[PDB]
Amino acid sequence: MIQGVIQKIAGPAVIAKGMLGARMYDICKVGEEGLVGEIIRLDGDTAFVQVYEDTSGLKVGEPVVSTGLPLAVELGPGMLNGIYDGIQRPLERIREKTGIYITRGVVVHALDREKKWAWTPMVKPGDEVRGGMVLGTVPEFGFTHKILVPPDVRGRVKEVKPAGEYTVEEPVVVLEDGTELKMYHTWPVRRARPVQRKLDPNTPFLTGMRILDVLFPVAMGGTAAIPGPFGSGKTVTQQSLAKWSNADVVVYVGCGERGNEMTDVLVEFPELTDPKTGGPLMHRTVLIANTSNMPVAAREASIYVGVTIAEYFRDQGFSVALMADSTSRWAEALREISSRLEEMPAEEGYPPYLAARLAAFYERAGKVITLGGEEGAVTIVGAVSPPGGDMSEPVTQSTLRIVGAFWRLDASLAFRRHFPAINWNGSYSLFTSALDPWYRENVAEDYPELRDAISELLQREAGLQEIVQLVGPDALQDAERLVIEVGRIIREDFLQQNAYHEVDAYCSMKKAYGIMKMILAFYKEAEAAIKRGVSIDEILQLPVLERIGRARYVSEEEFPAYFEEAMKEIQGAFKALA
Amino acid sequence: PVQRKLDPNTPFLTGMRILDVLFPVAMGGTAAIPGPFGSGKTVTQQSLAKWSNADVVVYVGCGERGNEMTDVLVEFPELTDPKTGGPLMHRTVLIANTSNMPVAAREASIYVGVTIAEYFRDQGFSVALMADSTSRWAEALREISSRLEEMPAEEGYPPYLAARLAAFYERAGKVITLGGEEGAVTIVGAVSPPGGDMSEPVTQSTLRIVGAFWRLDASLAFRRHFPAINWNGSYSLFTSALDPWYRENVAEDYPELRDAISELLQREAGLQEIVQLVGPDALQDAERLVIEVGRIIREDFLQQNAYHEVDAYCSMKKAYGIMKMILAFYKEAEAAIKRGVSIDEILQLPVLERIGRARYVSEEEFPAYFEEAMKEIQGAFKALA
Amino acid sequence: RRVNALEQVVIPGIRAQIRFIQQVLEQREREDTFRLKRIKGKIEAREAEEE
Amino acid sequence: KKEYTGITYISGPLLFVENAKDLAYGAIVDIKDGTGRVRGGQVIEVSEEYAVIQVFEETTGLDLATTSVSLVEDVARLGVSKEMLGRRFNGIGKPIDGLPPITPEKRLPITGLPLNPVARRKPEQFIQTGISTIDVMNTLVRGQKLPIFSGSGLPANEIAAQIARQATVRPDLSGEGEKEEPFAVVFAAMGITQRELSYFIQEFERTGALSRSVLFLNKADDPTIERILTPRMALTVAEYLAFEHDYHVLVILTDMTNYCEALREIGAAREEIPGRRGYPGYMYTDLATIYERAGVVEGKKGSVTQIPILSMPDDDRTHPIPDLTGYITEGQIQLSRELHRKGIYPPIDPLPSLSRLMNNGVGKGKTREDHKQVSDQLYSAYANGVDIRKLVAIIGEDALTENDRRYLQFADAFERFFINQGQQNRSIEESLQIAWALLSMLPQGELKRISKDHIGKYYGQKLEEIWGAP
Amino acid sequence: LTVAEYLAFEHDYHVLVILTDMTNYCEALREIGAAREEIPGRRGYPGYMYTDLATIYERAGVVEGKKGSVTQIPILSMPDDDRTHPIPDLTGYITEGQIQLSRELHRKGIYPPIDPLPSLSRLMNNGVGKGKTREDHKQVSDQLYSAYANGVDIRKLVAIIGEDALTENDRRYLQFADAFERFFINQGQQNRSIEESLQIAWALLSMLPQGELKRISKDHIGKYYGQKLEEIWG
Amino acid sequence: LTVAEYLAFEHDYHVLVILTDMTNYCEALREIGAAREEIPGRRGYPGYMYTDLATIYERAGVVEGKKGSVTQIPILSMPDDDRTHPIPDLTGYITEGQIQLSRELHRKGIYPPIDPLP
């Protein structure tokens, strides 16, 4: 590739000469130390590169070498159980050779070039292959890893490596035109991978949490945002979704978090366990980690590497969930990069194209039919931290227009220690009607009407909050006190789920349906018994209320017996007390 | 060059009650006085030149009116030196560079003035340096920088503006001279922000290096409540170091009285949030008393007339006596409230006029007036109820 | 009556003024950035391409 | 060694030298003129034809005929040793105490290599600062960055001096008995005046705290690039001592607003377009390379703790300097002007102050077991009392209930005794004793945040035994 | 101003100079400033506008040993009735006071609509006092200002709490302000002398209690207090 | 609009044109202009936005002697209840009316929430 020398150094910008033939946005190696850089200019024989690392100590005359490719990632076996930075460098292998500091100019490989993998072919010589097909399988933890021809390659095969142990560097399939296929291939992070067809959302994404699954559901392949003031509970909720959801592969992105919180999430995760198999949780997750003192170019590319990896695991047919820590810091990094380039800020300090980048990030999520004929889906959950509290912050305003679900958190409900702190008066979801045909054909025919009754009862109680503010709740009417107590029971025994608690952090669908059915039955029978006119004040202290709270902690396998017990207790109380 | 800098331990007596009592400045310290036009930055500096105890006063007219320099030339030969008995002009040096004079000479006037003030320091004197406007110096620097075609700061100023102000203010201080004597230079610089905006770069540059800060208010100047010092936005960092001198030279309990006055002002400032909400008539008597005492303090102690025959100059013991009278009245009224006496008849006592006109009493007549008013305070409240 | 008047009248009136002042100050900063860019471009041209 | 005499342009803080391609970017040079006076400078742009040098101090007296530029080092480096404890430096390594210069064990670059995120570990131990409002409610943990937000006229310097004079570790409260552990304080000041310099020297020398401290003091009339270089040398020394000699260091950065303003001036001098509010666009990155050098490292026995101090321009928490610090640091301590005007020192406000790593350093086996619940109960009771104290001004004390009057008295007693401690040095046991003595004013049963077992063991002690010496 | 200075200091004339609109002069200056790419001030005006205005205003005054004089009455329009605009600000930083007109007084039919609170005259103390106009001028002015400020403050309170909750003390100041704006400021085209103006001022101060005149010495109160306003107007 | 004009004025059709979101069009216009380094406008939008919007909205209408017609119903989303934002403001100066949706009527369940007063 083209090689040139330096003729100007001014901060992070380096002007090289002799670089005729270099392409825009390529990755260059600058200086004898070998610092990475990106070309953004072309003018005659000279090109302007922008160095990621510190340029102190460089001298005029040091060579510049181009790699000929833009920013890309290595996709292949060995990405699970790994920790990477914003530009896919393994943090564990760097520590082995260097120490507790990250010396600049270090060279490492994303995929371990010296680990043997078991190879099992699935094609024979003489076959015709096209981009996206499957040729070969590799075991990897509890998964089987499929070897894919790159989407831009078509040809005819006459070479098959027989079943044996090989590294990812060894060719396995050689085409008629001389193309050699390996176990890994590169892909630029800012170009979306092709698909056959994009499908409609018709299956729910089971978060395992009662309120998020019932009141504000998100489908498989949807997008959700969870904003709120600092100290609300975003991180624990995202970790709970990572632990208990039905997604096969989980990708976590750290876009510049604080060092101590990054240490917290780096220490906590290896101690977790996979609920599906009982093994370590890290065997199915991929971690992208950045701190505040990393180079600013590595912070901007953090969300693109994660989404490219998620799209790679989508093409193999799995279901992928992509959790992203606060994108406000990613937008701050983008603003700093734009200020480096003098981009005439528009909104507050942000570049005018912030919404385009946010849309390009969120549009990759969906349920598609892959080029190999299989079906895969990607779900994206992102966090926002508006500093002013109000949702008029420009990043929040740009995010609100391209998301389907919106799980707003509130700090005041955290002060009452009611967790999760979901504001049910501000949150909304647009996926309910599409998920309704799935609900009635699988869960229960009466599920949507029961859910609407629960939501209507929650809405009625919010309309009485003015009268409670003037006069005490005891002076209110018996029916109004009834609906207030029903709302309180619904909140404290249906919307509560403690995440630090060991058995309060998960809830299935059948348990929630049974709890809603019991609550509606109790409400209707108590409403009739009030007009019955017997023991109207002692209705609030019936022994059935113990059975309502007991269903929160009953096991799923023991759930039908306790459901029958609670229903027949409701019958024996309301029918035959008086 | 000098031999050794010294810590400040002697107050710089300006003759104004609020500055000398609530926001003191030491002999070797620096102060800043910002405010909009028509607030009183020049009358304060001229009163400081007239009445302070500095041996030599240097006045720098950087970019101001010529009438303000003609007044000094005409009036000062007639006044009398407070500590020598001679003419007042025999101790004053004037550097005049008016607004219609050439622009480039505004910086040179400031440097010449500070060099002369440093020269008189080396002879053992205590010199006071008044800078009439440091914003005109920054404006001259902006005007010159437009010809050089540099890339400017936030408001068009050159980037090195904050270094010049720092290198100018750090020339003050109490030193041991190369001849073994003791001298001191104190600097009081006035700042004229455009439109009264305190977020101006000059004001924020000055705010980080000065030991005292006397913010002025346009609203108080509109209602002719001079000196119009904003008590909420003013501070002084020399309060703690000057306490041993006050105990020895004024009274043993003067800091306690000053702290009580500041505490009363803070309490009055706290209650004014409720008066704007529900009016003054919704408060209890214990809070109406605080409101009225704060009003009495503001109208009697803080207010000062610079053109009056007697009110222009006020010694330390006179301010101590006035503060003692106000606190004695407050302590009488606070106990009289607990006896069921309503406030609306306490304010009608004739001793209110006695306190309110102690300003205009002459310095030599004050020791009798104070002792009569103190007995009147005691006699007024025992027969109240 | 006083609570309702304060809740429905004064607070949005102050909030709108705050928003208006914020927009004006931000527009002034956006205006001066353009002049800084222009004078930097003028500095680059005359100090590097004259002879 | 080699000198360059091809000066072609001098204007303000910049000078151009031709045929100087041998110089490396960011190098330090010495400028010599006809009179023999030597100044300093930094190379900020290298080209094929000329190099650009920004000059320390002023450029008075230079001419194109006799000025020469010579090289010192290609990289700004500092020589460090364990002999620096008890010394003072001017921000660029030059001693100002009159003592002979040090001998270096090593020479290290002042720029900071980032810590590997997989090499860090979780903070677990706390630092006793001797201040009740910090030790009890806003606990400082070994490895935390806890900035202090102060006003314009508030005594931040006195609080910093008191913390540096009183800070210590408590091995006897941890584990089976722990072990002897060294401790040191690294003090860095930026843009201070002569009064602050004299006050700091007098405070540090009068009580023996200098024997365990290193001071990097930079005056206001000093060159601005020394202010930029000032905190990085202090952090280099702190990292060297902590991660090579197993020290527990505490780093105090006296003023960060001066650092940000000097950074703005330096950026404006090099023709860079400003960012959001006139400040440079890379200010978030620049502040991150300073704060994130603190922490604790897995496998190493030392630690670094940071207490930045910054002044809000108009008590404005939406200003960029306090705004960007909140995205990198863990909590804040906010001083109160109302408490300062009422005669209370230190005027630390308990309500807006917060520490995020507090829950990991308290409990059983570290400090005392009742710490967190006592802190929560104090917070809630003070929050009730401050609102009742303003309701009293409308409705009077006669219309109150009895428990509201209990809260009203508790708030005044809190402000009188717990916060206003003066120049005293309080251990954690004494602070907990006073905290329980204040809570005994409230009747048992209103303490909803505290378990019955702790109430049955610590409630009921009279305040009269501390009333004789508050 | 060249002609005015020549006439004043070469032939002992007393010259009055009137400038119709300095806003137009500032706009004409801004055109050349923007054409020459100068560094702007606060709102696009050139940074040297303070110096340029200083060379115009500072040519008035009197000269020792000469009988001539120059007096300047510039007229300028605050654009959005704004006192913080660069032109009024830089004008007030140079001149020796200002007379500010009020639109609120104009909407009530009062002529001339001079608002006394933002108005200022720096050279007032030189020309008033004993032996020049009268011995009670300055104290009367101070008392009028202090009473009118309280009247405006009580006006700002009656719009919040209603006038039915007022005491008599606040009502007296409210009535004083209401009568002041109608009788003192509103004069039409008549030519009041100084004695008539002082008579009206002392008549207005008689509405207030005698003991509330803190800024007036008791001799002047004993000499002039007690005049009734109905003897002059009605 | 080119297709609609052709159909209406060369085949006598009655064509109704709906533009789904003009806020995205204005944002895309701001992104293009800001990269060409020209002076911005009221909120960073280019100063020629009125002319560019007028070249779109003014293509509707009827023509004498022809049976065809073109009708436009653009839909735009305000950032707030801010009627003074540059996009709805400059839309108001060119178009011949407006239909404003009400959040209060939507909050209490009225559909469609058209507010008759603005």
Ligand SMILES: Nc1ncnc2c1ncn2[C@@H]1O[C@H](COP(=O)(O)OP(=O)(O)OP(=O)(O)O)[C@@H](O)[C@H]1O
């Ligand atoms: N202490 C005081 N006592 C009496 N009158 C005062 C006092 N301070 C100010 N004044 C009055 O207020 C006027 C303020 O004019 P001054 O020359 O002090 O203005 P300034 O605020 O310094 O403005 P600038 O120099 O920017 O024009 C004085 O002329 C005088 O009439």
Ligand SMILES: Nc1ncnc2c1ncn2[C@@H]1O[C@H](COP(=O)(O)OP(=O)(O)O)[C@@H](O)[C@H]1O
């Ligand atoms: N489900 C939950 N169970 C218990 N505590 C919770 C839960 N959700 C939130 N919290 C509390 O909310 C606080 C905020 O947590 P975290 O997400 O780490 O910070 P932030 O919300 O600012 O990102 C935590 O202290 C945690 O105790």
Ligand SMILES: [Mg+2]
């Ligand atoms: Mg978080």
Ligand SMILES: [Mg+2]
């Ligand atoms: Mg003046």
